[PDB]
Design a protein around this motif. Structure first.
Motif, short mmCIF file in Angstrom:
data_model
loop_
_atom_site.label_atom_id
_atom_site.label_comp_id
_atom_site.label_asym_id
_atom_site.label_seq_id
_atom_site.Cartn_x
_atom_site.Cartn_y
_atom_site.Cartn_z
N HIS A 86 0.83 -1.20 0.00
CA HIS A 86 0.00 0.00 0.00
C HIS A 86 0.86 1.26 0.00
CE1 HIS A 86 -2.36 3.21 2.16
NE2 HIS A 86 -3.15 2.94 1.13
N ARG A 90 0.91 4.28 -2.83
CA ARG A 90 0.66 5.69 -2.53
C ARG A 90 1.83 6.55 -2.97
NH1 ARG A 90 -4.21 7.25 0.58
NH2 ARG A 90 -2.79 8.96 1.12
N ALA A 246 -13.17 5.88 -7.88
CA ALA A 246 -13.01 6.86 -6.82
C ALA A 246 -13.27 8.28 -7.30
CB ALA A 246 -11.60 6.76 -6.22
N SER A 247 -13.01 8.57 -8.57
CA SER A 247 -12.97 9.95 -9.05
C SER A 247 -14.26 10.42 -9.70
CB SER A 247 -11.83 10.13 -10.05
OG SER A 247 -12.03 9.34 -11.21
N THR A 250 -17.76 10.73 -7.16
CA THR A 250 -17.53 11.60 -6.01
C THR A 250 -17.48 13.07 -6.42
OG1 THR A 250 -15.17 11.16 -6.26
CG2 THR A 250 -16.39 9.82 -4.66
N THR A 251 -16.58 13.42 -7.34
CA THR A 251 -16.43 14.81 -7.76
C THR A 251 -17.70 15.37 -8.38
OG1 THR A 251 -14.10 14.35 -8.15
CG2 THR A 251 -14.97 16.41 -9.03
N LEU A 308 -19.62 19.88 0.84
CA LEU A 308 -19.21 18.54 1.24
C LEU A 308 -19.71 18.19 2.64
CD1 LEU A 308 -15.56 18.45 -0.14
CD2 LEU A 308 -17.58 17.30 -1.08
N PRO A 313 -20.22 13.00 -0.32
CA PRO A 313 -20.33 11.98 -1.37
C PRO A 313 -20.02 10.59 -0.86
CG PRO A 313 -19.06 13.90 -2.12
CD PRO A 313 -19.20 14.01 -0.64
N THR A 317 -16.75 4.40 5.55
CA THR A 317 -16.01 3.26 5.02
C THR A 317 -15.59 2.35 6.17
OG1 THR A 317 -14.12 2.55 3.68
CG2 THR A 317 -13.83 4.49 5.05
N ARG A 319 -13.17 -0.95 8.05
CA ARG A 319 -11.87 -1.49 8.42
C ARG A 319 -12.08 -2.84 9.07
NH1 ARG A 319 -11.30 2.77 6.16
NH2 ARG A 319 -9.66 4.33 6.51
N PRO A 377 -14.64 14.81 4.88
CA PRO A 377 -15.15 14.37 3.57
C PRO A 377 -14.17 13.50 2.82
CG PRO A 377 -14.38 16.61 3.40
CD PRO A 377 -14.26 16.24 4.86
N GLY A 379 -11.86 11.45 4.51
CA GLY A 379 -11.29 10.53 5.47
C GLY A 379 -10.07 11.11 6.16
N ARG A 383 -5.14 6.03 4.91
CA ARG A 383 -6.09 5.73 3.85
C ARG A 383 -6.84 6.96 3.36
NH1 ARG A 383 -5.71 0.76 1.21
NH2 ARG A 383 -4.73 -0.70 2.68
N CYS A 385 -8.07 10.22 1.26
CA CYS A 385 -8.31 10.37 -0.18
C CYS A 385 -7.04 10.75 -0.94
CB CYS A 385 -9.39 11.41 -0.43
SG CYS A 385 -9.81 11.54 -2.17
N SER A 391 -9.61 16.87 -7.02
CA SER A 391 -11.01 17.30 -7.02
C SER A 391 -11.13 18.80 -6.75
CB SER A 391 -11.80 16.53 -5.97
OG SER A 391 -12.06 15.20 -6.39
C1 HEM Z 1 -11.51 13.05 -8.20
C2 HEM Z 1 -10.43 12.35 -7.90
C3 HEM Z 1 -10.36 11.37 -6.72
C4 HEM Z 1 -9.48 10.37 -6.69
C5 HEM Z 1 -8.47 10.03 -7.81
C6 HEM Z 1 -9.66 9.64 -5.46
C7 HEM Z 1 -8.93 8.53 -5.08
C8 HEM Z 1 -8.99 7.88 -3.87
C9 HEM Z 1 -8.27 6.67 -3.51
C10 HEM Z 1 -7.31 5.88 -4.43
C11 HEM Z 1 -8.59 6.37 -2.25
C12 HEM Z 1 -8.07 5.16 -1.44
C13 HEM Z 1 -6.74 5.55 -0.80
C14 HEM Z 1 -6.10 4.37 -0.10
O1 HEM Z 1 -6.77 3.32 0.05
O2 HEM Z 1 -4.91 4.48 0.30
C15 HEM Z 1 -9.52 7.37 -1.76
C16 HEM Z 1 -10.08 7.43 -0.51
C17 HEM Z 1 -11.15 8.22 -0.15
N1 HEM Z 1 -11.82 9.10 -0.98
FE1 HEM Z 1 -11.17 9.84 -2.78
N2 HEM Z 1 -10.67 10.26 -4.74
C18 HEM Z 1 -11.13 11.34 -5.48
C19 HEM Z 1 -12.14 12.19 -5.07
C20 HEM Z 1 -12.85 12.10 -3.88
C21 HEM Z 1 -13.90 13.00 -3.42
C22 HEM Z 1 -14.41 14.22 -4.23
C23 HEM Z 1 -14.34 12.56 -2.23
C24 HEM Z 1 -15.42 13.14 -1.28
C25 HEM Z 1 -15.71 14.44 -1.20
C26 HEM Z 1 -13.57 11.38 -1.88
C27 HEM Z 1 -13.70 10.65 -0.72
C28 HEM Z 1 -12.82 9.71 -0.24
C29 HEM Z 1 -12.76 9.17 1.11
C30 HEM Z 1 -13.70 9.57 2.27
C31 HEM Z 1 -11.76 8.28 1.17
C32 HEM Z 1 -11.31 7.46 2.40
C33 HEM Z 1 -12.30 6.36 2.74
C34 HEM Z 1 -11.86 5.70 4.02
O3 HEM Z 1 -10.77 6.06 4.55
O4 HEM Z 1 -12.60 4.81 4.53
N3 HEM Z 1 -12.69 11.13 -2.91
N4 HEM Z 1 -9.74 8.28 -2.78
#
Ligand code: HEM
Length: 439
Positions: A86, A90, A246-247, A250-251, A308, A313, A317, A319, A377, A379, A383, A385, A391
């Motif tokens: 992981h 990252r 993911a992208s 959400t966005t 947000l 969105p 999540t 664990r 929003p 996390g 882990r 975002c 975004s």
């Molecule tokens: C638009 C491009 C985005 C990309 C490329 C993206 C990508 C990612 C990725 C790969 C993860 C997992 C990270 C990991 O497991 O290490 C993640 C986690 C997360 N994303 Fe995004 N994301 C985007 C936008 C958003 C938006 C707009 C939101 C909400 C406003 C969002 C909410 C979250 C949350 C809450 C997590 C963590 C979930 C948790 O920890 O349980 N993401 N994102």
């Protein structure tokens, strides 16, 4: 066993969820027991519970995805890998999403948003915002991930991702006539498409027809870990699949809702216009928006954050307890599931006074006054975002170019509802608006 999975599903689609947790907090408290998706689950509500889950990755918990999401995203992505793998993924992703790296893509993103607004908004008396935002958001990913500008090819990939996304919320029945089955077929088609893009890209890099930094595909292809190991094709495929999941949805939520909330709070729209017009006053005509201009959109980013908060969105999540953990007198056994939700802090008067009111001033002075683990929003922890700043860039540029293009706008249905049964909260009718272009 079914456990409380059915009642949770019912509440999720019901677009309530807050109640699902509220009544359990009223009866048992913030740390309570439940069964979800066939697993023993403990929900930790409130900031203290958020810190436990979010800040202790690989110490007491590990990311756990439900089986169906693992099959659709793949087992080789940053989201489905744990431990050392992981952290490496990252690091590879930080080569594109990191603050220093993101600045080199603002030009490409700005151009597409500018071209989209001019082509599909500028000359219309009325538009339906949601499908336009979805098109713009996907196309930006197609350009920035794969350098795909061909509109027919963008639409082809866009349609394919929609089919895959349907399966992530359908019942996980891998049978010929079910939605989950068609999603799995769509993922297979996407894998073959992305495999051909990888191959051609490898050739283009060897012949000096592509650079190592032009897009996400090149960044991941040229990444090597500390021991010189590159990512495998399966790791690149699954990461792209996961990053598309993911992208896209959400966005789309804050971009589609931002001008709906602003139309209900015109004083906030007034301050957005003044901020954006002031930025334009200090530029010569034809001068492109810069990363410095971006950082000057402080109030606009406050509006985006308040959007947000009210309509997250991602509700939360999951664990998995990789060790027996002692919390609040209780012992969460190893192998159990843990859940946090924004619904324990985002809509609560205790953390955000008058939570039902849209107040971008809550995030004044770059969020100085927001208590820890109350606004989440994206996390937090290991882990958090990967793409949040990606975004943020899309939202700010979109707002900027809209305000630049239009003097005003008027919702066709001011009482339009904001529901989402599927996780993403969106305007129930697509947020049709009448437009008034600047003369
Ligand atoms: C638009 C491009 C985005 C990309 C490329 C993206 C990508 C990612 C990725 C790969 C993860 C997992 C990270 C990991 O497991 O290490 C993640 C986690 C997360 N994303 Fe995004 N994301 C985007 C936008 C958003 C938006 C707009 C939101 C909400 C406003 C969002 C909410 C979250 C949350 C809450 C997590 C963590 C979930 C948790 O920890 O349980 N993401 N994102």
């Amino acid at each position: 066993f079914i456990g409380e999975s059915f009642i949770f599903l019912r509440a999720l689609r019901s677009n309530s969820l807050e109640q699902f947790f509220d009544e359990r907090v009223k009866k048992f408290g913030l740390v309570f027991k439940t069964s979800l998706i066939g697993h023993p689950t403990v929900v930790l509500c409130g900031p203290a519970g958020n810190r436990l889950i979010l800040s202790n990755e690989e110490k007491l918990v590990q990311m756990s995805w439900p089986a169906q999401f693992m099959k659709l995203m793949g087992e080789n992505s940053v989201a489905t890998r744990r431990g050392e793998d992981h952290i490496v993924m990252r690091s590879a992703l930080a080569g594109f999403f990191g603050p220093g790296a993101l600045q080199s893509y603002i030009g490409k993103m700005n151009t597409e948003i500018q071209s989209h607004i001019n082509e599909k908004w500028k000359g219309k008396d009325e538009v339906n915002v949601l499908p336009l935002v979805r098109e713009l958001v996907f196309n930006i990913s197609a350009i920035l991930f794969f350098n795909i500008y061909d509109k027919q090819e963008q639409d082809r990939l866009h349609k394919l991702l929609e089919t895959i996304l349907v399966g992530s919320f359908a019942l996980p029945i891998d049978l010929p006539g079910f939605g989950f089955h068609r999603a799995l077929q769509g993922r297979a088609k996407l894998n073959k498409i992305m495999l051909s893009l990888i191959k051609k890209r490898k050739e283009d890099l060897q012949s000096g027809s592509a650079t190592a930094t032009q897009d996400l595909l090149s960044v991941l292809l040229t990444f090597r870990d500390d021991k010189g190991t590159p990512l495998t094709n399966d790791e690149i495929l699954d990461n792209f699949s996961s990053l598309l999941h993911a992208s896209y949805d959400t966005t789309t939520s804050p971009m589609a809702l931002i001008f709906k909330l602003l139309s209900s709070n015109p004083e906030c729209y007034q301050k957005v216009v003044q901020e954006q017009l002031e930025i334009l006053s200090n530029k010569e005509e034809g001068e492109e928006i810069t990363w410095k201009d971006l950082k000057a959109m402080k109030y606009t980013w406050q509006v985006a954050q308040e959007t947000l908060r009210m309509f997250p969105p991602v509700f939360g999540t999951f664990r998995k307890a990789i060790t027996d953990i002692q919390y609040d007198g209780y012992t969460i056994p190893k192998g159990w599931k843990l859940l946090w939700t924004t619904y324990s802090t985002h809509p609560k008067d205790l953390y955000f006074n008058e939570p039902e009111k849209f107040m971008p001033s809550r995030f004044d002075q770059e969020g100085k006054h927001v208590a820890p683990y109350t606004f989440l929003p994206f996390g937090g922890g290991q882990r958090s975002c990967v793409g949040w700043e990606f975004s943020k860039m899309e939202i700010l540029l979109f707002v900027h170019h809209f305000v630049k293009t239009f003097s005003s706008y008027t919702p066709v249905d001011p009482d339009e509802k904001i529901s989402g049964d599927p996780l993403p909260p969106l305007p129930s009718k697509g947020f049709s608006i009448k437009l008034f272009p600047r003369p």
